[PDB]
Coordinates of all heavy atoms in Angstrom, one line a residue:
Chain A
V8 N 107.6 -94.5 155.7 CA 106.8 -93.5 155.0 C 107.6 -92.7 154.0 O 107.2 -92.4 152.9 CB 106.0 -92.7 156.0 CG1 107.0 -91.9 156.9 CG2 105.0 -91.8 155.4
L9 N 108.9 -92.6 154.3 CA 109.8 -91.9 153.4 C 110.1 -92.7 152.2 O 110.1 -92.2 151.1 CB 111.1 -91.6 154.1 CG 111.3 -90.3 154.9 CD1 111.1 -89.1 154.0 CD2 110.3 -90.1 156.1
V10 N 110.2 -94.0 152.3 CA 110.5 -94.9 151.2 C 109.2 -95.0 150.3 O 109.3 -95.0 149.1 CB 110.9 -96.3 151.7 CG1 111.0 -97.3 150.6 CG2 112.2 -96.2 152.4
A11 N 108.0 -95.0 151.0 CA 106.8 -95.0 150.2 C 106.7 -93.7 149.4 O 106.2 -93.7 148.3 CB 105.6 -95.2 151.1
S12 N 107.1 -92.6 150.0 CA 107.0 -91.3 149.3 C 108.0 -91.2 148.2 O 107.7 -90.7 147.1 CB 107.3 -90.2 150.3 OG 108.7 -90.2 150.7
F13 N 109.2 -91.8 148.3 CA 110.2 -91.9 147.2 C 109.6 -92.7 146.1 O 109.9 -92.5 144.9 CB 111.5 -92.4 147.6 CG 112.4 -91.3 148.3 CD1 112.8 -91.5 149.6 CD2 112.9 -90.3 147.6 CE1 113.6 -90.6 150.3 CE2 113.7 -89.3 148.2 CZ 114.1 -89.5 149.5
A14 N 108.9 -93.8 146.4 CA 108.4 -94.7 145.4 C 107.3 -94.1 144.6 O 107.3 -94.1 143.4 CB 107.9 -96.0 146.0
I15 N 106.3 -93.4 145.3 CA 105.2 -92.8 144.6 C 105.7 -91.5 143.9 O 105.2 -91.2 142.8 CB 104.1 -92.5 145.6 CG1 102.8 -92.0 144.8 CG2 104.4 -91.5 146.6 CD1 102.1 -93.1 144.2
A16 N 106.8 -90.9 144.3 CA 107.4 -89.8 143.7 C 108.2 -90.2 142.4 O 108.1 -89.6 141.4 CB 108.4 -89.1 144.6
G17 N 108.8 -91.4 142.5 CA 109.5 -91.9 141.3 C 108.5 -92.3 140.2 O 108.8 -92.2 139.0
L18 N 107.4 -92.9 140.6 CA 106.4 -93.1 139.6 C 105.7 -91.9 139.1 O 105.3 -91.8 137.9 CB 105.3 -94.1 140.1 CG 104.3 -93.9 141.1 CD1 103.0 -93.3 140.6 CD2 103.9 -95.3 141.8
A19 N 105.7 -90.8 139.9 CA 105.2 -89.5 139.4 C 106.2 -88.9 138.4 O 105.8 -88.0 137.6 CB 104.9 -88.6 140.6
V20 N 107.5 -89.2 138.6 CA 108.4 -88.7 137.6 C 108.4 -89.5 136.3 O 108.3 -89.0 135.2 CB 109.8 -88.6 138.2 CG1 110.9 -88.3 137.1 CG2 109.9 -87.6 139.3
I21 N 108.5 -90.8 136.4 CA 108.7 -91.7 135.3 C 107.3 -91.8 134.5 O 107.3 -91.6 133.3 CB 109.2 -93.1 135.7 CG1 110.6 -93.0 136.3 CG2 109.2 -94.1 134.6 CD1 111.0 -94.2 137.0
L22 N 106.3 -92.2 135.2 CA 105.0 -92.6 134.6 C 104.3 -91.7 133.6 O 103.7 -92.2 132.6 CB 104.0 -92.9 135.8 CG 102.8 -93.7 135.4 CD1 103.2 -95.0 134.8 CD2 101.9 -93.9 136.6
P23 N 104.4 -90.3 133.6 CA 103.8 -89.5 132.5 C 104.5 -89.7 131.2 O 103.9 -89.2 130.2 CB 103.9 -88.1 133.1 CG 103.9 -88.2 134.5 CD 104.7 -89.4 134.8
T24 N 105.6 -90.3 131.1 CA 106.1 -90.6 129.7 C 105.4 -91.8 129.1 O 104.7 -91.6 128.1 CB 107.6 -91.0 129.8 OG1 107.8 -92.1 130.7 CG2 108.4 -89.8 130.3
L25 N 105.4 -92.9 129.8 CA 104.7 -94.1 129.3 C 103.2 -94.1 129.6 O 102.9 -94.4 130.8 CB 105.5 -95.4 129.7 CG 105.8 -95.7 131.2 CD1 104.8 -96.7 131.9 CD2 107.2 -96.3 131.3
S26 N 102.4 -93.7 128.7 CA 101.0 -93.5 128.9 C 100.3 -93.5 127.5 O 100.9 -92.9 126.6 CB 100.6 -92.3 129.7 OG 99.2 -92.1 129.8
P27 N 99.1 -94.1 127.4 CA 98.4 -93.9 126.1 C 97.5 -92.7 126.0 O 96.6 -92.7 125.2 CB 97.6 -95.2 126.0 CG 97.4 -95.6 127.4 CD 98.6 -95.1 128.2
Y28 N 97.7 -91.8 126.9 CA 96.7 -90.7 127.0 C 97.3 -89.3 126.9 O 96.6 -88.3 127.0 CB 95.9 -90.7 128.3 CG 95.0 -91.9 128.4 CD1 95.3 -93.1 129.0 CD2 93.7 -91.7 127.9 CE1 94.4 -94.1 129.1 CE2 92.8 -92.8 127.9 CZ 93.1 -94.0 128.5 OH 92.2 -95.0 128.6
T29 N 98.6 -89.1 126.8 CA 99.2 -87.8 126.8 C 99.0 -87.0 125.5 O 98.7 -85.8 125.5 CB 100.7 -87.9 127.0 OG1 101.4 -88.6 126.0 CG2 101.0 -88.6 128.3
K30 N 99.0 -87.7 124.4 CA 98.6 -87.1 123.1 C 97.1 -86.7 123.1 O 96.7 -85.7 122.6 CB 99.0 -88.0 121.9 CG 98.4 -89.4 122.0 CD 98.9 -90.2 120.8 CE 98.4 -89.8 119.5 NZ 96.9 -90.0 119.4
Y31 N 96.3 -87.5 123.8 CA 94.9 -87.2 123.9 C 94.7 -86.0 124.8 O 93.9 -85.1 124.5 CB 94.2 -88.4 124.6 CG 94.0 -89.6 123.7 CD1 93.7 -90.8 124.2 CD2 94.2 -89.5 122.3 CE1 93.6 -92.0 123.4 CE2 94.0 -90.6 121.4 CZ 93.7 -91.8 122.0 OH 93.6 -92.9 121.2
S32 N 95.6 -85.8 125.8 CA 95.5 -84.7 126.7 C 95.9 -83.4 125.9 O 95.2 -82.4 126.0 CB 96.5 -84.8 127.8 OG 96.3 -85.9 128.6
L33 N 96.9 -83.5 125.0 CA 97.3 -82.3 124.2 C 96.2 -82.0 123.2 O 95.9 -80.8 123.0 CB 98.6 -82.6 123.6 CG 99.3 -81.4 122.9 CD1 100.8 -81.5 123.1 CD2 99.1 -81.3 121.4
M34 N 95.5 -83.0 122.6 CA 94.4 -82.7 121.7 C 93.2 -82.0 122.4 O 92.7 -81.0 121.9 CB 94.0 -83.9 120.9 CG 95.1 -84.5 120.0 SD 95.6 -83.2 118.8 CE 94.1 -83.1 117.8
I35 N 92.8 -82.6 123.5 CA 91.7 -82.1 124.3 C 92.0 -80.6 124.7 O 91.1 -79.7 124.6 CB 91.4 -83.0 125.5 CG1 90.9 -84.3 125.1 CG2 90.3 -82.3 126.4 CD1 89.6 -84.3 124.2
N36 N 93.2 -80.4 125.1 CA 93.6 -79.1 125.6 C 93.7 -78.1 124.5 O 93.4 -76.9 124.7 CB 94.9 -79.2 126.4 CG 95.1 -78.1 127.4 OD1 94.3 -77.2 127.4 ND2 96.1 -78.3 128.2
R37 N 94.2 -78.5 123.3 CA 94.3 -77.6 122.2 C 93.0 -77.1 121.7 O 92.7 -76.0 121.4 CB 95.2 -78.2 121.1 CG 95.4 -77.2 119.9 CD 96.3 -77.8 118.9 NE 97.7 -77.8 119.4 CZ 98.7 -78.4 118.7 NH1 98.5 -78.9 117.5 NH2 99.9 -78.3 119.2
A38 N 92.1 -78.1 121.5 CA 90.9 -77.9 120.6 C 89.7 -77.2 121.3 O 88.6 -77.4 120.9 CB 90.5 -79.2 119.9
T39 N 90.0 -76.4 122.3 CA 88.9 -75.7 122.9 C 89.0 -74.2 122.6 O 90.0 -73.5 123.0 CB 88.8 -75.9 124.4 OG1 90.0 -75.4 125.0 CG2 88.6 -77.3 124.7
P40 N 88.1 -73.6 121.9 CA 88.2 -72.2 121.4 C 87.8 -71.2 122.5 O 86.6 -71.0 122.8 CB 87.3 -72.2 120.2 CG 86.3 -73.2 120.5 CD 86.9 -74.3 121.2
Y41 N 88.8 -70.4 122.9 CA 88.5 -69.3 123.9 C 88.0 -68.1 123.1 O 87.0 -67.5 123.4 CB 89.8 -69.0 124.7 CG 90.1 -70.0 125.7 CD1 91.0 -71.0 125.4 CD2 89.6 -69.9 126.9 CE1 91.3 -72.0 126.3 CE2 89.9 -70.9 127.9 CZ 90.7 -71.9 127.6 OH 91.0 -72.9 128.5
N42 N 88.8 -67.6 122.1 CA 88.5 -66.4 121.4 C 87.7 -66.8 120.1 O 87.4 -67.9 119.9 CB 89.8 -65.7 121.1 CG 90.5 -65.3 122.3 OD1 89.9 -64.9 123.3 ND2 91.9 -65.4 122.3
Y43 N 87.4 -65.8 119.4 CA 86.6 -66.1 118.2 C 87.4 -66.6 117.1 O 88.5 -66.0 116.7 CB 85.9 -64.8 117.7 CG 84.8 -65.0 116.6 CD1 83.6 -65.6 117.0 CD2 85.1 -64.8 115.3 CE1 82.6 -65.8 116.0 CE2 84.2 -65.0 114.3 CZ 82.9 -65.5 114.7 OH 82.0 -65.8 113.7
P44 N 87.1 -67.7 116.5 CA 87.8 -68.2 115.2 C 87.4 -67.2 114.1 O 86.3 -67.3 113.6 CB 87.3 -69.6 115.0 CG 86.0 -69.7 115.8 CD 86.1 -68.7 116.9

Side-chain angles (χ1 to χ4, degrees):
Chain A
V8 64
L9 272 297
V10 175
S12 68
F13 282 118
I15 191 76
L18 68 87
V20 171
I21 296 169
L22 193 60
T24 60
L25 53 98
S26 178
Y28 289 96
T29 62
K30 58 184 288 293
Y31 290 161
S32 301
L33 193 143
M34 292 303 292
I35 296 300
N36 201 355
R37 179 177 290 175
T39 59
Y41 288 91
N42 299 320
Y43 189 78

